[PDB]
Amino acid sequence: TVPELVAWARKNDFSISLPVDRLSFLLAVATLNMSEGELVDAFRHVSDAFTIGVRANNAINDMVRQRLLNRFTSEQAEGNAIYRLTPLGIGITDYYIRQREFSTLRLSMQLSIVAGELKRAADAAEEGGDEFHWHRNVYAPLKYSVAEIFDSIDLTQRLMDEQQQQVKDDIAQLLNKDWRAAISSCELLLSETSGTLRELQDTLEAAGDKLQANLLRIQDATMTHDDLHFVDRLVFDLQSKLDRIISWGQQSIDLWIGYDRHVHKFIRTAIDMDKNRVFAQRLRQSVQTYFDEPWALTYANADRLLDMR
Amino acid sequence: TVPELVAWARKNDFSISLPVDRLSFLLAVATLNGMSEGELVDAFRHVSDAFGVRANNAINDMVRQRLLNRFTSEQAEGNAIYRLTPLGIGITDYYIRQREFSTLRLSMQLSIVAGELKRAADAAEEGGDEFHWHRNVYAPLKYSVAEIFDSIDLTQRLMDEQQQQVKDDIAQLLNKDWRAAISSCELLLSETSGTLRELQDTLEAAGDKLQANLLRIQDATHFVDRLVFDLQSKLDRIISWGQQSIDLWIGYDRHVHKFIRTAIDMDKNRVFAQRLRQSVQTYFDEPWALTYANADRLLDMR
Amino acid sequence: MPVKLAQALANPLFPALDSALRSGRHIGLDELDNHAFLMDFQEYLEEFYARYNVELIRAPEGFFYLRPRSTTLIPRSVLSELDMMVGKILCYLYLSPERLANEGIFTQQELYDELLTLADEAKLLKLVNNRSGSDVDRQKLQEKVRSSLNRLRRLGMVWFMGHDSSKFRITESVFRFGADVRAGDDPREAQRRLIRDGEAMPI
Amino acid sequence: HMPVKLAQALANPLFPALDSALRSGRHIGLDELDNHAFLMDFQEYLEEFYARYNVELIRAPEGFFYLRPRSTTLIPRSVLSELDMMVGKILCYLYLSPERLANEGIFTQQELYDELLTLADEAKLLKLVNSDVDRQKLQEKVRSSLNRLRRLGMVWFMDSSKFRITESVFRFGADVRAGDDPREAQRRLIR
Amino acid sequence: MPVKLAQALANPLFPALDSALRSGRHIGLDELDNHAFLMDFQEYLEEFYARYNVELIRAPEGFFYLRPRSTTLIPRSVLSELDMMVGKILCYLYLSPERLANEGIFTQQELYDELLTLADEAKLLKLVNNRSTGSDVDRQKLQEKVRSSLNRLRRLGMVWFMGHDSSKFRITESVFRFGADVRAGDDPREAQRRLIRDGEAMPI
Amino acid sequence: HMPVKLAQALANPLFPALDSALRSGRHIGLDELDNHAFLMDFQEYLEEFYARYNVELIRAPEGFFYLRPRSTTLIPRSVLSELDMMVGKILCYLYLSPERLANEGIFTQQELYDELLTLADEAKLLKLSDVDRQKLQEKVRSSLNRLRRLGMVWFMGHDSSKFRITESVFRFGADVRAGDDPREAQRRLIR
Incomplete structure (x- = not known):
């Protein structure tokens, strides 16, 4: 299983090669998105923004081997073929294009939608029924609505994470520009994202138990019937996903409090004492200049006590 | 704008370099996700083995390529932790994930959308302060409905992956069993035709309903109308490529029957093919030319 | 009448x-x-x-x-070896699984590739120029395959797609390129019979 | 029907x-x-x-x-070289001349050439080939125009050294003005 | 008393x-x-x-x-030029925004890198081996030595290591001492002649 | 308090x-x-x-x-070489010999070295050749100093040539059996 999948990978030579160029190309193709001719017009604007025909059919071909790009041959069409994007082209394109989704309103709406889907799934899990009653009433809205919305909340987190890392980097370069100047700013960016990271986690825990509880009624109802292994495996996996989410969501907070604390400390030590940043610059000058006139610090160093053997 | 984006792209050097190693590793990582720095190193160990300085090379460049988000944690083993980014998530997902398509799934989605869009239309009319306008009208459009629409665009683009599959399966089936595989391939064909049919029946089913509530909103509405338009366009683009795919699939159906009739029904032992090739190399040993009626064209003046 | x-x-x-x-x-x-x-x-x-x-x-x-x-009122002409190869390979691809993915449609490149595979790249060039691995000669061989391919379009072998020459179908007619073979037999006997029945000629 | x-x-x-x-x-x-x-x-x-x-x-x-x-001909159509037409036009000037009534129907490739360097401009003539080497190419090129033309019913060979000219050659004949001496009109068409 | x-x-x-x-x-x-x-x-x-x-x-x-x-009962020792570089830098890191993502923790490498950045890679080598050019083995002695001087500067209380290994550490205000020559805005020569008189330093 | x-x-x-x-x-x-x-x-x-x-x-x-x-000492510790301790034990043998009462307390580097090569084995001494024999005297010469900073001895006048042995040298002293010659026990402890 665990080594074996890796054995599955090198078997199909799945490789995704997207240096700055192919990538910029995919992003363009995504900006207009169609057909093969259009695809080649695109590859024109791209090759040009930097042998067009052959490098274009080359690009296109390693697009369809790597399953970035699905293809259907349509003769009715300019070039005699048409090209959509596979889920993969989409995810990759999405990442660099899609706007941030940070809105507590959005997470509110999503959790409401899951509340419903889950509740219904449960009522209908405990009201019994044929195979149909379960694949339609329980199983679908779990596999199809609920777990997908969970993966969407999981995304909202892992995006939120990348926003953190941005704010860290912003604070870095802001102190690196304006030194004791940039304090107010780095104290906004710091107390703002400690606010966001609070609400997103208040909501999750708030609607956290309700969801779990209903996930349970269902699990509960699975208990009486022996045919329902699929609804069992799913409800478990589903519970896990919710935990993994609330855990990490509580945890990103403790890590961000670490960060925040230690940035107040930087301010108190590194800046509050050298307010014009002078000391540092002069430190540098003294680091390159050292060997012109060297000197060494002195330190108390006692004679060790000699013992025997 | 159009050419300008590219110029944003060469400015930050965004590059996804994923040979079979870096990707198999990413795949191990997303297998363990369902973490910290040592964990990453153990992972890379299992990676290099399946084939330490190379572990830190990998990890480093995995963060430069923004596949990976990283945080300094003290208590943590190695003083670092690693989560996949929305990006890492996407790539890993496509492979590691079972994307199993069902019509049920599509309907399920459609329902939710008819609900949110009804709520959003009714509420849309009854008039409001800009809470009743942002919370009840706009937000369900931007957040709920559009989102699920891209869930339907995803679901479709997955179905596509299935078709392309059906085509390879038919190609190697034929390539191996020759005249045998016929019934099988006629089955794969008939079936994916049915599958595409239902997908369409359902899309059209809820197509005009969603369009018409979208319309009630359009009338009773700027940023909200520019939303409604694009949702309209995405519902049209969707239904559109949705029929187009039926037609194109028949364009496979028909032609594959023409391959059976043409290329197979007429050489069963697939002897003719071999012989033909042996003859292609052996050609210049004893050369021959075909003949044709070649009339004289009618010469004219000027 | x-x-x-x-x-x-x-x-x-x-x-x-x-x-x-x-x-x-x-x-x-x-x-x-x-x-x-x-x-x-x-x-x-x-x-x-x-x-x-x-x-x-x-x-x-x-x-x-x-x-x-043997006597025709309508004059008769004979294909060149190059036209022959390109035909034989038109057939091959007519019979290949390689076709099933293409949906009936091929491209100049493909044909050229398959051709250098199966054929002897060295004598196949001897056609173009009496003695030559030269790079100019490798274009001429391409221009020629292009031509031979045009001809064989006139002959009803091949349908060209759209307004360009790049993309094209293939047709049953092409089987004709394999008659020497199609009845399982000595190639030599079948050639001798194909010359008899005025299917072909020697070169 | x-x-x-x-x-x-x-x-x-x-x-x-x-x-x-x-x-x-x-x-x-x-x-x-x-x-x-x-x-x-x-x-x-x-x-x-x-x-x-x-x-x-x-x-x-x-x-x-x-x-x-x-214009819409369902029958493959080709066209004659400028030199084909020149040669045809000259086989008409020859068919007309007295010279033909003397020779008793028959001309030589030679005369066909000479009257070509004469009643036409040697310039464009040789220009179309590419000089002593280009003149032979011209000669051989005329011979092969003669040929395209025999096939057309314009001549019969008598060996291709000597030939008869038909009435079909009036296709290459000029616009006759109702009793102008055909000669004049014809070297006008040639010029 | x-x-x-x-x-x-x-x-x-x-x-x-x-x-x-x-x-x-x-x-x-x-x-x-x-x-x-x-x-x-x-x-x-x-x-x-x-x-x-x-x-x-x-x-x-x-x-x-x-x-x-001048008269001390407890013997006095001095740091090596190498230790002093290692230190000055250490103070720079202490004062850089690099730290801020690092949450205070630096590495054997981060140090070593910033070092060859800001110092003279060449003379910095001339310490390790009196004359050697571009050498490789000699670029390990520069690292090992630089480890040693980071270890020693730990005894001294400049720097706290992290965990059971020597790989990651962190930095005490104590390092600011490497910055004495410059702390007072002044001709570094003057201020050095000063620290030499006051027992803070020694010439080499 | x-x-x-x-x-x-x-x-x-x-x-x-x-x-x-x-x-x-x-x-x-x-x-x-x-x-x-x-x-x-x-x-x-x-x-x-x-x-x-x-x-x-x-x-x-x-x-x-x-x-x-x-073992738990809050004061930094260190230790003497196998040599420093051979030297010390020897300095005790001197302190116990009659040669000290004759010399009225005073010894020379040499006498130390000589007594060294005798009571111990010359093998392991050098093990820690004529250059190898000078090293030895330079490291014994260093031993005397380590041991003088320890009060086991004092240097007489302007140089390290001649030196006096303290009573502290008894630390290197063998275990005396109460009524025996501290010599015998002390060369046995040197062996």
């Missing part, structure tokens, strides 16, 4: 088709109106062409074409 | 080889007797026949027949 | 701290027990040490150390 | 200086008077003061003080 023949000379296709036939166009399942025409009147049109000393032939694989007799 | 005499024409023993030669751009003169007369006989009919293929069967005033392709 | 001095000598802390102090340990806010101790009993602990001909110093940045004197 | 006689000891002039030397491993023997008497006067409290560093202020039977570091 037979009532039916007169009926076919008076059909709105006949003339165009005739000029086509007389020019060497092998008429496949691909042209419905034409093929159904030659089907319906086949017996008679057989005779009408007979009159010019040429036989109207239907290969077993369903297509039609005019085979010049 | 198709008419009785028409069928009767198409069944004539002559029809096939003639059909071939008409469609080849040949002109059927009086030097082909069986054919000529065959053709006169059935003209009303063959005329329409060939109309189906979008071509007009035509009889020149001087009384010879040829196939003239419409 | 004054009451408070004695009361100082009695705290359970003293013997060990005192030992450290006499082996040249600088004492940063990072040891609360100790730093606090010195804060409390300073004025007297000062005298106590003065009797050994050594001054007890509180750097302006708040840390304490022993600064042996 | 702290004793008044300890407080009283700590503020003595001798103390800081002595603190340093004891803690350096030095043995204070009779030859250092102000110090040695000062120690006797305070053993009670000093012995308590140094045990907070988890080290014992110990006074020998022959009456010389020193600080013996415990």
Whole structure:
């Protein structure tokens, strides 16, 4: 299983090669998105923004081997073929294009939608029924609505994470520009994202138990019937996903409090004492200049006590 | 704008370099996700083995390529932790994930959308302060409905992956069993035709309903109308490529029957093919030319 | 004169088709109106062409074409070895699984590739220039395969797609390139019979 | 439908080889007797026949027949080189001259050449080949124009050294103005 | 003897701290027990040490150390130029925004990198081996030496390691001492002749 | 709380200086008077003061003080080479020989070296050739110094040529059986 999948990978030579160029190309193709001719017009604007025909059919071909790009041959069409994007082209394109989704309103709406889907799934899990009653009433809205919305909340987190890392980097370069100047700013960016990271986690825990509880009624109802292994495996996996989410969501907070604390400390030590940043610059000058006139610090160093053997 | 984006792209050097190693590793990582720095190193160990300085090379460049988000944690083993980014998530997902398509799934989605869009239309009319306008009208459009629409665009683009599959399966089936595989391939064909049919029946089913509530909103509405338009366009683009795919699939159906009739029904032992090739190399040993009626064209003046 | 023949000379296709036939166009399942025409009147049109000393032939694989007799009124011409290869390979690809993915449509590149695979790249160049691995010569071989491919379009082997020459179908007619082989036999005996029946000629 | 005499024409023993030669751009003169007369006989009919293929069967005033392709011709169409037409135009100037009535029908490749360097401009003549080496190419190129033209019913060889010129050559003849000496008009067309 | 001095000598802390102090340990806010101790009993602990001909110093940045004197009873030692580079840098890191993502923790590498950045890779080598050019083996001795001098500067209380290994560490205000020559905005020569007189430094 | 006689000891002039030397491993023997008497006067409290560093202020039977570091010692520790200890044991053999009463306490580097090559085996000595024999005397010569900073000996006048042995050297002394020649036991301990 665990080594074996890796054995599955090198078997199909799945490789995704997207240096700055192919990538910029995919992003363009995504900006207009169609057909093969259009695809080649695109590859024109791209090759040009930097042998067009052959490098274009080359690009296109390693697009369809790597399953970035699905293809259907349509003769009715300019070039005699048409090209959509596979889920993969989409995810990759999405990442660099899609706007941030940070809105507590959005997470509110999503959790409401899951509340419903889950509740219904449960009522209908405990009201019994044929195979149909379960694949339609329980199983679908779990596999199809609920777990997908969970993966969407999981995304909202892992995006939120990348926003953190941005704010860290912003604070870095802001102190690196304006030194004791940039304090107010780095104290906004710091107390703002400690606010966001609070609400997103208040909501999750708030609607956290309700969801779990209903996930349970269902699990509960699975208990009486022996045919329902699929609804069992799913409800478990589903519970896990919710935990993994609330855990990490509580945890990103403790890590961000670490960060925040230690940035107040930087301010108190590194800046509050050298307010014009002078000391540092002069430190540098003294680091390159050292060997012109060297000197060494002195330190108390006692004679060790000699013992025997 | 159009050419300008590219110029944003060469400015930050965004590059996804994923040979079979870096990707198999990413795949191990997303297998363990369902973490910290040592964990990453153990992972890379299992990676290099399946084939330490190379572990830190990998990890480093995995963060430069923004596949990976990283945080300094003290208590943590190695003083670092690693989560996949929305990006890492996407790539890993496509492979590691079972994307199993069902019509049920599509309907399920459609329902939710008819609900949110009804709520959003009714509420849309009854008039409001800009809470009743942002919370009840706009937000369900931007957040709920559009989102699920891209869930339907995803679901479709997955179905596509299935078709392309059906085509390879038919190609190697034929390539191996020759005249045998016929019934099988006629089955794969008939079936994916049915599958595409239902997908369409359902899309059209809820197509005009969603369009018409979208319309009630359009009338009773700027940023909200520019939303409604694009949702309209995405519902049209969707239904559109949705029929187009039926037609194109028949364009496979028909032609594959023409391959059976043409290329197979007429050489069963697939002897003719071999012989033909042996003859292609052996050609210049004893050369021959075909003949044709070649009339004289009618010469004219000027 | 037979009532039916007169009926076919008076059909709105006949003339165009005739000029086509007389020019060497092998008429496949691909042209419905034409093929159904030659089907319906086949017996008679057989005779009408007979009159010019040429036989109207239907290969077993369903297509039609005019085979010049030993005596024909309508002059007869013979393909070059290069046209032959390119044809044989047109057939190969007609019979390949490689076609199933293409949906009936090939490209100049493909053909050229398959061709350098199977063929002897070294003598295949001897065609272009009497003695040459030269890079200019490798373009000429390409221009020539292009040409031979055009010709074989006139001949009814190949349908070109759209307004360009890059993308093209293939047709049953192409089987004709394998007759030396198609009845399992010595190649040498079958050639000797193909020369007899005026299917072919020696080079 | 198709008419009785028409069928009767198409069944004539002559029809096939003639059909071939008409469609080849040949002109059927009086030097082909069986054919000529065959053709006169059935003209009303063959005329329409060939109309189906979008071509007009035509009889020149001087009384010879040829196939003239419409724009929409269903019959492959080619065209003569500038040099073909020059040569044809000159075989007309020769057919007219007294020289022909003396020689008793017969000319030599030579005279065909000479009258070409004479009644036309040597400049464009040689220009079309590319000099002593280009002159031979011109000579051989004329010889092969002669040929395209024999095939057209414009000449008969007597060996290709000597040849007869037909009335069909009046195709290359100028606009005669109603009793102007054809000579003048013809070297005007050549110029 | 004054009451408070004695009361100082009695705290359970003293013997060990005192030992450290006499082996040249600088004492940063990072040891609360100790730093606090010195804060409390300073004025007297000062005298106590003065009797050994050594001054007890509180750097302006708040840390304490022993600064042996002209006449000292407790022997005095000096740091190597290499240690001094390692240190100066260490102070730079302490003052850079690099840290801020790092949450205070740096690496054997981060140090070594910033070092060859800001220093003269060439002379920096001329320390390790008196004449060697571009060498590779000689670029390991520069690392090992640079590890050694980072270890030593740990004894001294400049830098706390992290965990069971030597790979990741962090930095005490104590490093600011490497910046003495420049702390006072001044001609570095002047201020060096100054520190040489006051027992803070020695020429090489 | 702290004793008044300890407080009283700590503020003595001798103390800081002595603190340093004891803690350096030095043995204070009779030859250092102000110090040695000062120690006797305070053993009670000093012995308590140094045990907070988890080290014992110990006074020998022959009456010389020193600080013996415990396992848990809060004072930095170090150790003497196999050589330093051979040297020391030898210095004890000298101190016990009649050669010291004749020489009236005084020895020369040489006599040390000679006594060294005798009672031990020359093999392991060098193991730690004529250049190898000079090294030995340079490292024994260094041993005398390590041992002089420890009060096992004093250098006489302007040089290190001649030196006196202290009573502290008894630390390197073998286990005497009570009524035996400290020589025999002491060369057996050298073997």
